[PDB]
Symmetry: D3
Subunit: 231 residues, 6 copies
């Protein structure tokens, strides 16, 4: 639509959703064959190509609920996208979340008002598609890549003075990022399938960072789990 300059057919049934349009470029060129780039609108690149003879697209989302909602909306409405898989990172908020872990979000908490706007006095708990969830999980187990299944927290403010993540951590939440709630909610709304796969960028509470070498490895594992889940 408005935000994606592609012709129908240029986008696959399955799309991967990095936040960074350069991580989109990177993924495609490193992982896929016969790459075509279908969108340059706003520099939020989308690429279609193939992986083991099966078409896969990879589309930047931007940061925040309102940005990804745009792309997820159009991908669904204008291009009949069936599987949508966020591949990104999160800030870990618990010691037991290890920097090599690969996270599969079952659900997500949020301070985005997107759902309270739709639902009023209902707390809508979004939900990953289980078939995709299990595939990814199996793909990880099969190869021995360390994986954790629980929830994340989709923030509106990266810099947030009134952050309640200390309380979210006690309730089991694994980490913070900025897209999952939007993804899971829009996909379910339109009878599509979605899943969010995440790496640990750093520990937000211990302030402790992860090295460029740790980031590259888990990144590659993430893409692997995503691609192998779709085989």
């Amino acid at each position: 639509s408005v935000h994606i300059g592609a012709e129908k057919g240029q986008i696959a049934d399955t799309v991967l959703l990095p936040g960074d349009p350069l991580r989109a470029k990177f993924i495609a060129e490193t992982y896929l064959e016969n790459v075509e780039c279908y969108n340059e609108v706003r520099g939020m690149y989308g690429f279609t190509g193939t992986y083991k003879g099966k078409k896969i697209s990879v589309q930047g989302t931007g940061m925040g609920v309102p940005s990804i909602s745009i792309y997820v909306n159009e991908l669904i409405q204008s291009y009949d996208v069936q599987n949508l898989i966020r591949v990104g990172s999160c800030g870990a908020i618990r010691k037991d979340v290890k920097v090599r872990d690969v996270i599969l979000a079952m659900t997500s908490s949020t301070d985005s008002q997107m759902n309270r706007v739709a639902f009023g006095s209902v707390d809508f708990a979004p939900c990953a598609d289980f078939e995709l969830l299990k595939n990814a999980y199996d793909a990880a187990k099969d190869k021995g890549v360390p994986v954790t299944v629980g929830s994340v927290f989709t923030a509106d403010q990266f810099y947030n003075d009134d952050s309640q993540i200390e309380k979210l951590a006690k309730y089991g939440v694994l980490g913070v990022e900025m897209e999952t709630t939007a993804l899971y909610t829009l996909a379910a709304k339109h009878g599509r399938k979605a899943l969010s796969i995440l790496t640990v960028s750093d520990h937000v509470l211990t302030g402790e960072e992860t090295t460029a070498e740790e980031r590259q490895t888990t990144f590659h594992d993430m893409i692997d789990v995503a691609l192998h889940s779709v085989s």
Copy 2:
């Protein structure tokens, strides 16, 4: 505590959580060996007994978030209960939810204020324990019992003039019941494991009912999946 008249040790690591204290009585006597009844307070019976040489307790919860929260709180705080497994029914709100299906709740939406009281402007999405979730799922697949994984809706009002379930159905929600949010939220809060396994009592939207014979079968499958998941 206050609500459970038991001596420490009388309650197993794993407790099953029917809504009905008579379904508690029924489950124990039909499924377990050497049954002892540890609680008669308020007629909300709890029973400990064994299944294949492993201790399992079964404790009535009552109906509603505030009732189950009581029992889940005390079971956790006063008796160090590790696994808590709701076995109950739900009203289905989608055609694709079939009356023979067995539901495993990944998460739950609610109009209970329990979480908005704790979290303010955060929408807290509760989360099933995945290890328990997968066990139950495997137990079902192994035996060929039909199973669905998604979300339910924990209502406060059984009779609810302002029910939004028509909108919840469009977003993928499977059915309505009255306990899951409380269960999943309290268990995560205290580092314990929880899962909610449900049968389809009827279709709320199509008004269409399920027969006493359908109810008995799926009920038995539910208990099986619950017990076999714990083996």
Copy 3:
């Protein structure tokens, strides 16, 4: 309906509403003549019998807004119940509320979302029926039983980390329990009459407890005021 296995006529115009179905059993057998038990569904016993030649029923409610709402709904809708009188206990939250006092709730505050779901941005203050309120008050004065008239607080969480009762106490609130808001709101909604009569179970803030002998006496006074108000 669904929750009460009775035939029409088996339930009186006036029903008393203990929380505990065993306190239901107890009340009936101790206070009424020719007791019939009309409901065993879920072990939430209801009993009809007579007191001085006038029919009175006594029905367990369970704990929490969502539980009592069920019974109050069905009692009203399926059995044309006119007077509904909660007889239960509360935790006192002020020094001036004395352990021998009998409380008549004029109204109730809540953190239940039941009313915000119905009303949006209106704070609905529920209201006892005054004719019943005055009767009970008179019955107490006549016999010299100590009585207090003010408000209570209907909680959702018995165990509540974010309890504001310290602020509720300053505003005059007398004590905490878990049913009144539901009772008063549903009864008014259907043009019926309701009242909540309560004993002081203990002081929540001073942590100070009440003895089994104090509980028995005030309990008996409570039933007396309830029964004599209905004479």
Copy 4:
């Protein structure tokens, strides 16, 4: 304080609270002896005088929660006022509320945010002082003046496009006015006594009006009940 130009002692233990400062002037001159006028600030007149040898003050409040809160605050804080009695009118919202009826508010619903600001996710139900309530009720019964006891609705918007009074009426609410919630809430907060006594200005829903002769009579009865309750 800021809003009342009086010297300590100039204001009685008991104050009556009309909305209209000219109804303040009127009440005093018609009902009281040896009238002194203690406040002319902003033309919101307050008068002290006597009725049967007992001092009574009468103080205008203005319209709206935020206006009366000012006067009730200062009367309490700066002049140790013990009894505060709103004498005003309301718009009736039910057929059964008759234009000659005199209303005693047990409680009040509101769309004012005053309490949600103080309490967050608690619905605070304000509460009339029962001793004052009963006195007024008795005074009415004694003289045979028709009286009704229930709740009113304190509005913020006189002209309100999103008025929910049609729903409030079904739940038993008697009528709409603009002060009671503030009165009852501030008085309880400071351990004082308050009551709101109201006449039916008109029926808001039937659009049907009341004549100048009906208004005068019920007005006089209102003052009588107020004064006789204080005797």
Copy 5:
């Protein structure tokens, strides 16, 4: 209407809106020629007269959102008032707001629920009419009267235990008063023009007061800017 006893034509296109009906009396008699007083209802005086041969009315509002809303509603609906200009004072909440400054409100924050009632989950930011805003600003600059343009905070509680003004100050808010949000919101709603011009009554946070001589001067400047803006 109900609240203003005037005949059509008695009220000018432009009305000034002091809070105090005696400041209404004062303004008219000091600033206008051939003064007629059109309203005495409730002692909330309105006056029409002339200033340099142009008709200007001046109408008391009372205190609080719900009070001014009444007068602004009727002035708009029953008397086709085009320009409405609040002339009042505010409590300053920042050091940089100087006691001689004259404030022009671009917008206003509030804890009034008036807008959340209308809009649900939208934060409605009210807006001054810019043409009026600029006129007033120019009038000030022309004469060298010190002027500041930013936002104020419309409070519901003058005495407010849960005041967040310390946080409002950090976000740039200039001062607190009790009417602006109502004014700006109702005027925009009906395609009319509104502006709020304010003097600094005192600094709320530094507790520091302003002398009767400072108040008189800035008051006079305020009226000047208001009148000259309308020339």
Copy 6:
């Protein structure tokens, strides 16, 4: 910081804030001299260059409150940016907003929860810096470029089933976009200066579109007003 790969000094006191990083590239190359590009992180380009010998930077923001908040935060915190000026487009929601008009936002309404998270029960009305506002306005008047001053609406959902813009239009709101509330709120919070200047992309309600030639012209006028306001 994290999101901007620049060295201190590389970013000017004044930054322009298009949504589109390619509109950032375009603006700089067309309007500025000696352009250096300081940021390529995530392809959200920032450029510093000069306009009439004065340094001006131009930085992409992405779409949505959470995206721009990131850039506005870092620009303020890590690079001491003083003036921040959004240059973008909006969807007009009123007939009187003409496709050639240039909008200066005094304030903005939102359904973003960003402020309710910070403020609870306060409606925070953000506020443009008036000195910048007036400069831009003057720059427009001087050259005769058509300009309108009022409010806009910052949406979270571009595709929004529960859009209330029909009600926002009646209250005077000019158009919808996705950044202003974040901009104005963060800038005020840190004692900086902000303004949002917008073109009319299309009329959302009349569905009627604007041609590529209309867009180019108003775009150029927008940049002119922005640059000339800063001269």
